[PDB]
Amino acid sequence: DAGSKQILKTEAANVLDPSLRKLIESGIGTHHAGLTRSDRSLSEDLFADGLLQVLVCTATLAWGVNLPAHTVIIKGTDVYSPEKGSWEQLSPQDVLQMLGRAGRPRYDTFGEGIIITDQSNVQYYLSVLNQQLPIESQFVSKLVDNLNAEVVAGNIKCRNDAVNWLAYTYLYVRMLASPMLYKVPDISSDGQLKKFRESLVHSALCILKEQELVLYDAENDVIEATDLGNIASSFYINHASMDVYNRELDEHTTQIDLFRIFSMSEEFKYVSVRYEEKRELKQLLEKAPIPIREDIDDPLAKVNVLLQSYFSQLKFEGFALNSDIVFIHQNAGRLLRAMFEICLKRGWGHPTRMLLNLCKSATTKMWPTNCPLRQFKTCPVEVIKRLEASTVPWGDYLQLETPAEVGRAIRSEKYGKQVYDLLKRFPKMSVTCNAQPITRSVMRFNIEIIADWIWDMNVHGSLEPFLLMLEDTDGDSILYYDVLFITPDIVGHEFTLSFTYELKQHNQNNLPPNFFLTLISENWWHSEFEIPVSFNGFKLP
Amino acid sequence: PSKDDIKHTKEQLPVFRCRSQLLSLIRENQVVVIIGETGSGKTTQLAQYLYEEGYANDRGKSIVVTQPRRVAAISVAKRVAMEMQVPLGKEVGYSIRFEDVTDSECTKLKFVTDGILLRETLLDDTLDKYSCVIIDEAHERSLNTDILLGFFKILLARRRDLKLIITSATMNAKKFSAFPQFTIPGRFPVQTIYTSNPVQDYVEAAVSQAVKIHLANDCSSGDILIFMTGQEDIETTFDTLQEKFLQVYINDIEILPIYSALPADLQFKIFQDLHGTKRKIIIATNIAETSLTIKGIRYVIDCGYSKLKVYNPKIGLDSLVITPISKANADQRSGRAGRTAPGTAYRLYTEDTFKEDMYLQRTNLSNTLLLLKSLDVTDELSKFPFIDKPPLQTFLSSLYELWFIGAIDTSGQLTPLGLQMAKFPLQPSLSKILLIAVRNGCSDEMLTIVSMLSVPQVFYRPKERQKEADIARNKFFIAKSDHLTLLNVFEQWRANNFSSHWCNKHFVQYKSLVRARDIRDQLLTILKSQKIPVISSGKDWDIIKKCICSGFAHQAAKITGLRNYVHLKTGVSVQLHPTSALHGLGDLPPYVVYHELLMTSKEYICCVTSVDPFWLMEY
Amino acid sequence: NEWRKSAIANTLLYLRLKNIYVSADDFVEEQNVYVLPKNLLKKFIEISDVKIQVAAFIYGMSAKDHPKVKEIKTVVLVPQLGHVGSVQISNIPDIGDLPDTEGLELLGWIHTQTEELKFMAASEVATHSKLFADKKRDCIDISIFSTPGSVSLSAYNLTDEGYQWGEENKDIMNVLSEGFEPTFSTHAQLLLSDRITGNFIIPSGNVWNYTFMGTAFNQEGDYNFKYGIPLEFYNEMHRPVHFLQF
Lengths: 541, 619, 246
Hints:
Chain A: Belongs to the helicase family. SKI2 subfamily. Chain A: This is Pre-mRNA-splicing helicase BRR2. The structure is cut from a larger assembly and holds chains A, B and C. By secondary structure, chain B is an alpha/beta fold. Chain B is built from 23 helices and 18 strands. Chain B is globular, with a radius of gyration of 24 Å. The termini of chain B are far apart. In chain C, the strands form two sheets. In chain C, strands 1, 2, 3, 4, 7, 8, 9, 10, 11, 12 and 13 form an eleven-stranded mixed β-sheet that branches. In chain C, helix 3 packs across helix 4.
């Protein structure tokens, strides 16, 4: 009481905010993420210094920190898999990570590890901590996805390349050695499993061909790489998910549909709407900004409403569901991108344009219909609210080239000088484009571009990339595209682009009035700049 | 507990059913447009909801105000303080001519007259720190209301971060669209009659008597609320009614007159409850038209007339003129009836009913042009997307008036004089004279006189009382000048502060002295904010009264015998107003300047001040 | 959320364009023929609502071959506030200062509706007079009857009685129906063609649909315009408010 208490109770007060403090006064801490960075560092350091007798942890401590104790107790080993949409037992590596905390090597004579679980599990965790749970290959489960990626890397053209590859897998070393486990037909006939390999490869390839990730001729024996398989590999997408994206994505695919297609992804197969959370979920499904055609019975409605929530950063009470949603954003990014990639390849102007936003929306954790002053981390919270409610066009604020003027529109003086500086750091382009008919069928387009922002390294990074499309008059058909990467040495100075595009027969006979040429920031909201490309006086040769 | 009871109460009012839809719409839009029944809560509760949904998710706000009339500002400020369980200068506070009870800076909500916020727009051409104005009684088409639209439309095109609100119970939806609406369903009902022969001379005292006998054959307990046009027809009708009662017939009825000029205690007696079987029978002007909730009123009437004030530009002639009301005035009047029980209204509405004919909402545009060109809304006035500005004729009077004043240059662009004047909550003629009064070093007496030629009447005149009492006339002392009666009254009043008693003892109207004080100290504070030298300093009463000639500057008079006049705008024949100090004598300088020219049964000239030939000749 | 149901509906609005019907009568070479590029129709429906009216101006010009064949070149979509059975439209846009606008005539307006008629209705006539009464009298009206399954186009002129009657009606109520005549309007010759492609001109702010912003709708607004691809009716930008709840 004499030694600790003044040294504890000094330290207990200073940085402690929550209910954590009434615990720390008692010498027991808590430690999880989503807890103040200073607050968890106190916990670590007080426990380290003998003052806390008991730190109660989420699992992160086990990978993150180096904070040992003599004793480590796992309470319970029940964990929630959002992937599997279900509760489950601690994995072995988690338990072994956790138990690596037990026993201070320098100080303690020994260490103690206590697992607490249902009797059913005890046998299992015994095996884990006592060198008796075997390490076995799951390579078949992901075989189709992983084969495709080597097919896409062009190291497989014929299925002998495939059965050689498989020889460098763990599966293979492990099949030779316990063929009964891996359900080999007959090792003695198959030798080093040459027919087995070939057979796996076959079945794999056929399901791939079935889904248009590859081109396969069994008879001939030629493996070939599709553009769609090439997306699946590059963006690390499940073959099944590429299938859904294949069938469902359309020239007439719509925002409301995208959310559905997104939610159809294999990655979210197990997501289920559990009875308890359903009441809360219904509350959100009826305040949903983008219509949901699907029922609240349907799993798809959950994934959809969850993703719409992440875009609006909705506060969630249930732990179950909050884990679920997290699982969604960490995949949302690269799925929505795979979706975008397909639509761009296929030419569909309008869904491509929309997907690009969803991608932005999932980076920036916000919706399109928000002025991007909110996108600068370095803006105050009140100032944007006054620029959103007013209704003045976003671009309207950008036009003013005077630091006083920008401040008058805000209606604040000191925020008006700092926001002027921010404004100048918002990306913008100038585009001009004339066209030159090379032949009747072939038109060359000559573009001149200036990039107009002032570079800041914290706000822009090493580069800001920019999608350039030339699209038909309807604005539905992407005729050319290319991505421009602007860098600090590029801004301010003019450059030129040229490209050819071959007019369709229709347009060859009657030139349309114009095409469009558009530049969109991959990263920065409402930095799109498009101009009409006239064919007014033109004679095609 | 008292505040949690106030909460419970609030959560029964009709507008509470919409509070989240409302709050979303405001947050999402520069502009809004509440529409909702008379008593529904729109006043009391909208700015509560805005303040609250800062204060309850860690934020702060500001705000501003609900409606046009002094009595509404003060009264529904004092209400909303009670519905917060706070004293007025915490989150309450008002600001009116001659009276102010400021709020703290920060959270806090700011209940003002229209004209006062116009004056405050001089120190902020941006009206900033103010998150959220409100809108109150928008359908009272007063020149200040219509000016403050023009300025707010332009502000919201500059400063999206700002929020408006709009608000009435009686308002053209189509007109609002032209200039998100939110409809608030629910109150009591008000059953409305229409007289059924030409209402041609509309204190048909026959119609009045017979209606009050009918609404006394129905044994329905409640108070009546007639609406009349001014003190003349209030005093004739009330007196006539009393005479008829003696002839046809207190221990059944009490008549009560309600006009801006009556003693403040008599005004407060409208809202008080009469003995046992005594029905209370208000005879009021448009000061009871809007916002109020006279508990007890079941049974309106409505003579369908008001007291307008009517410039002509080409000859520079003002005139009071009895005019048909507008459908919006009719609707507001009727709304006084079904706030606390079911009511009736009795629209004495046939001829100029033609109700169809009755204009939905007529006013000189010059002040509103200055706001359109001081927010830089800068195309031009006549391509402002009004509503109205209505007639092109009145537009070109206002542009020519600003041009001749040197508020506008050769290009139609504001001068520094014009910018300053657009920030003063005055007439621009009065703003010009105020700047001449700040040079001279006479600003403070000019400020009193400009405020006084923008305020309710200052003397109290009993019922039929044909003139001032000779105490009130011996507030001018020597100088035949209404303007110096009203100064000597204001000096003396500002000392007393036992000032209900001082007012009583000198027959002066307490809330006109307070309004005039407040107007004077606002116009001084806006002066100082626009970087000016005040003072007062020598034979200033002479330089000052001279300056009055340039602030009301076609308003010059002759005197051609007892109570007979002669406007120096070609020789027309007028009468000194029976309220004036100069309502009888031979005096010393036959030239007067006046504040108003007022059509009645003759033309009459109002607040006068005798002014020497040199004063008329060089301002 | 009446709109949610309509918004979902509008996704299939592209299917209505497998059934395109055009009102036809005896060809008269004495009077004009209006040619509406098929692509413009397809798009204009694609961005329309199933219940609420949606409208635009049409600008075009005569060919040399026949001075009476008016090809429609551009559809100008402008700030407006739709309703069932009527629509409030802003004034004729200033597009003078845009490129390729050399010698376009304003030919009239085009709009959706949910009541198939053979004549211009009473909200039509009110609005047609409001827009064109004092400005350009020969401006046609192309009425599109859009319904599940199909779209049906119908072109009208308005007689001076029509205009006058429309001038008399500043406002239209559900019930009043006073003085109206089906003979106010006359069949105008419309041909849909797929061999010319027209384009759009949209407000510079990009939003044309001020339903959820009905306070900010300026019905005599001086607005800016550009060539561009028009937004859908329930496009997120036409709904700032719904993203506030979330």
